[PDB]
Amino acid sequence: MQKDLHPKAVPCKIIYQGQVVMETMSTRPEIHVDVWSGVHPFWTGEERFLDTEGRVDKFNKRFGDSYRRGSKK
Amino acid sequence: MKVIFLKDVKGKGKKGEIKNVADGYANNFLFKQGLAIEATPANLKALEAQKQKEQRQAAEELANAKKLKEQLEKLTVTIPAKAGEGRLFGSITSKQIAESLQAQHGLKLDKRKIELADAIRALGYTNVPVKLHPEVTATLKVHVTEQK
RNA sequence: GGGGGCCUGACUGCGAGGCCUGCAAGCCGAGCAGGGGCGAAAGCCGGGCCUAGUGAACCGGUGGUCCCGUGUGGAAGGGCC
RNA sequence: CCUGGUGUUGGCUCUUGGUCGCGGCGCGGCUGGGGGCCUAACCCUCGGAUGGGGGGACAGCGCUUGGCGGGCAGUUUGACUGGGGCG
RNA sequence: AGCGUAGGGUUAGGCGGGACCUAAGGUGAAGCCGAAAGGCGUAGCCGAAGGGCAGCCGGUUAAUAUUCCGGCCCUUCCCGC
RNA sequence: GCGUAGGGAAACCGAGUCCGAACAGGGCGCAAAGUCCGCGGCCGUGGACCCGAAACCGGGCGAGCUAGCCCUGGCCAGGGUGAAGCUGGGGUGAGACCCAGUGGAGGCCCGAACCGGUGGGGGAUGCAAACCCCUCGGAUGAGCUGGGGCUAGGAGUGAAAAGCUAACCGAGCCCGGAGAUAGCUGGUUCUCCCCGAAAUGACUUUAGGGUCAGCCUCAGG
RNA sequence: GUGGUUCGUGGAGCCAUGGGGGAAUCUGGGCGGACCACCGCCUAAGGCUAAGUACUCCGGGUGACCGAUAGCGCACCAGU
RNA sequence: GAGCCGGUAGCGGGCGUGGAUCCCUGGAUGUCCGAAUGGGGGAACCCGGCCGGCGGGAACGCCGGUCACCGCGCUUUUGCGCGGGGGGAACCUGGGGAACUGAAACAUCUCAGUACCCAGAGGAGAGGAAAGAGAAAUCGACUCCCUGAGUAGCGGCGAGCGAAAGGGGACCAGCCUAAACCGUCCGGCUUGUCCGGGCGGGGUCGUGGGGCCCUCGGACACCGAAUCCCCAGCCUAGCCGAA
RNA sequence: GCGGAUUUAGCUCAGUUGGGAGAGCGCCAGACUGAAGAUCUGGAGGUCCUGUGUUCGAUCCACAGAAUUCGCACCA
Instruction: For residues B102 and B143, state if they share a domain.
Output: yes
* Positive or negative: CA dihedral A22, A28, A32, A34: positive
Q: How many residues does chain A have?
A: 73
Instruction: For residues B34 and B86, state if they share a domain.
Output: no
**Partners of B78 in beta bridges:** B143
Q: Show the domain range for B102.
A: 60-148
Which strand D bases fall within 7 angstroms of a protein CB? 7-11, 40-43, 57, 60-64
How many angstroms is C1' of E17 away from CA of A34? 61
DSSP character for A42? -
Residues 6+ apart with CB under 8 A from B134: B65
Instruction: For residues B20 and B55, state if they share a domain.
Output: yes
Dihedral-angle region of residue B19 (phi above 0 means left; psi in -120 to 50 means alpha; beta otherwise):
beta
Instruction: For residues B23 and B88, state if they share a domain.
Output: no
Where a domain ends, among B10, B40, B59?
B59
Whether B38 contacts chain A with CB within 8 A: yes
The CATH number of the domain holding residue B8 is 3.40.5.10
Q: What is the resolution of this structure in A?
A: 6.8
The CATH number of the domain holding residue B144 is 3.10.430.100
**Rounded to whole angstroms, how far apart are CA atoms B134 and A57?**
55
Three-state DSSP class for A46? coil
Where a domain ends, among B33, B59, B85?
B59
Residues 6+ apart with CB under 8 A from B1: B19, B20, B21, B22, B23, B25, B26, B27
**Rounded to whole angstroms, how far apart are CA atoms B143 and B120?**
12
Instruction: For residues B103 and B118, state if they share a domain.
Output: yes
Instruction: For residues B39 and B87, state if they share a domain.
Output: no
Beta strands at B138-140 and B128-130: parallel, antiparallel or unpaired? antiparallel
Nucleotide nearest residue A17, measured CA to C1': G2
SS3 sequence of chain B: CCECCCCCCCCCCCCCCCCCCCHHHHHHHHHHCCCCCECCHHHHHHHHHHHHHHHHHHHHHHHHCCHHHHHHCCCCCEECCCCCCCCCCCCCCHHHHHHHHHCCCCCCCCCCCCCCCCCCCCCCECCEEECCCCCCCEEECCEECCCC
Where a domain ends, among B38, B59, B80?
B59
Q: If you measure CA to CA, which chain B residue comes closest to A61? A: B24
Instruction: For residues B32 and B65, state if they share a domain.
Output: no
**Rounded to whole angstroms, how far apart are CA atoms A4 and A56?**
6
* Among A17, A45, A47, A15, residue whose Cα is nearest residue B28: A45
* Among B58, B81, B72, residue whose Cα is nearest residue B108: B72
DSSP character for A57? -
Cα-Cα-Cα-Cα torsion B113, B115, B121, B123, nearest 10 degrees, comes to -90
Instruction: For residues B73 and B120, state if they share a domain.
Output: yes
Instruction: For residues B17 and B79, state if they share a domain.
Output: no
Instruction: For residues B36 and B50, state if they share a domain.
Output: yes
Which strand I bases fall within 7 angstroms of a protein CB? 73-76
Chain A residues close to B25, C-beta within 8 Å: none
Measure the N-to-C terminal CA separation of chain A; round to a whole number of Å: 23
Are the C-beta atoms of residues B31 and B5 closer than 8 Å to each other?
no
Count CB-CB contacts under 10 A for residue B66: 14
**Rounded to whole angstroms, how far apart are CA atoms A42 and A54?**
12
Count CB-CB contacts under 10 A for residue B14: 15
**Rounded to whole angstroms, how far apart are CA atoms B1 and B24?**
9
Count structural domains, chain B.
2
Instruction: For residues B105 and B55, state if they share a domain.
Output: no
A66 contacts B38? CB cut-off 8 A: yes
Instruction: For residues B110 and B124, state if they share a domain.
Output: yes
Are the C-beta atoms of residues A36 and A51 closer than 8 Å to each other?
no
